[PDB]
Design an enzyme around this catalytic site. Structure first.
Site, PDB file in Angstrom:
ATOM      1  CB  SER A 111      -2.120  14.270 -13.405  1.00 47.63           C
ATOM      2  OG  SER A 111      -2.450  14.102 -14.764  1.00 47.63           O
ATOM      3  CG  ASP A 135      -1.848   1.186   1.290  1.00 51.39           C
ATOM      4  OD1 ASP A 135      -1.920   1.903   0.289  1.00 51.39           O
ATOM      5  OD2 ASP A 135      -2.491   1.395   2.346  1.00 51.39           O
TER       6      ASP A 135
END
Length: 330
Positions: free
Chosen positions: A199, A35
């Site tokens: 992004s 994770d």
């Protein structure tokens, strides 16, 4: 040194991925959920409330000649999905794919919430976010990666998640045969303890690319792709009959649909998520309403580049002094 381990989806939907981990002496092999969105290595154990264990493999510290109780240490964690776990702490030898850390904090669950109990395929989590998020008290503990970092040929690990298929976590090296073209690296903020990056925008199907900064985290521990409501609306508007359902808890779409791809920007590069990756199947057995793999982050408070996004790429988690993220197509 290096490590290389295969990671396997837990079910037909790629809801999560499990990776075998050797704990203790002799080895006890547990299948953990790696994770990059948390920083605790915790396991079902001989100490876990009996009623809360249902099929998982347990770590038994008393059977490990290298296990030592970390006196006074406790841990307690709650995840973005509402699940939780807590217990005490041992140090022991932990090996991933041939890579060995001695003295790793192994967090022994005394209690787990129902969702962990109900998932018999996941024996624990192995956190790979930054150690600043580690919940051990009163002495915070380091992640497996942090502990191995110095020993590694290169201070990196890579996530190569499969679509409906096995993939690979590598530690300490970049497998140049594992991706196509170049790796585009992008800046990371560690201020929230996550692999947080921005992004450069998105496209829906064959649509034009929208240049826009989308701040989010690379999170292998989250199944889906959680993005701003505007982005997600633009995507699902391209699927006839798709709708946001309050009762189901997100966007659903007719199972008869062919989903469009979703492209996200990494600097000047582009990662294309195939439409098939965004189909998470019937909301309930036999339903013709299917759950979307792209969902709104509104009310999460953070955008999450979960497995839906990450499995479309080869992803480099670069833990150099100034951490960065790298994405390549594959």
């Amino acid at each position: 040194s290096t490590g290389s381990a295969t990671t396997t989806p837990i079910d037909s939907l790629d809801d999560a991925y499990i990776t075998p981990v050797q704990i203790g002496t002799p080895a006890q092999t547990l299948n953990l959920d790696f994770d990059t969105g948390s920083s605790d290595l915790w396991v079902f154990s001989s100490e876990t409330t009996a009623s809360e264990v249902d099929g998982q493999t347990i770590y038994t510290p008393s059977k490990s000649t290298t296990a030592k109780l970390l006196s006074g240490a406790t841990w307690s964690i709650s995840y973005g999905d509402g699940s939780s776990s807590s217990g005490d702490v041992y140090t022991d030898t932990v090996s991933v794919g041939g890579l060995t850390v001695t003295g790793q904090a192994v967090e022994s669950a005394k209690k787990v919430s129902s969702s962990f109990t109900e998932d018999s395929t996941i024996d624990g989590l192995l956190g790979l976010a930054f150690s600043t998020l580690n919940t051990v008290s009163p002495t915070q503990q380091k992640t497996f990666f942090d502990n191995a970092k110095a020993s590694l040929d290169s201070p990196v690990f890579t996530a190569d998640l499969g679509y409906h298929a096995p993939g690979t976590y590598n530690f300490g090296f970049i497998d140049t045969t594992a991706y196509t073209g170049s790796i585009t690296y992008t800046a990371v903020s560690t201020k929230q303890g996550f692999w947080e990056w921005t992004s450069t925008g998105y496209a829906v199907g064959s649509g034009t690319f929208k240049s826009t900064s989308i701040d989010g985290i690379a999170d292998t521990g989250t199944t889906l792709l959680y993005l701003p409501a505007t982005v997600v609306s633009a995507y699902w508007a391209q699927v006839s009959g798709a709708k946001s359902s309050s009762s189901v808890g997100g966007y659903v779409f007719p199972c008869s649909a062919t989903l469009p791809s979703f492209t996200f920007g990494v600097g000047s590069a582009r990662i294309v998520i195939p439409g098939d990756y965004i189909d998470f199947g019937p909301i309930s057995t036999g339903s013709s309403s299917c759950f979307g793999g792209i969902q709104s982050s509104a009310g999460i408070g953070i955008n999450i580049f979960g497995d839906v996004a990450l499995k479309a790429a080869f992803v480099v988690f670069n833990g150099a002094t100034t951490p960065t993220l790298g994405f390549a197509s594959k």
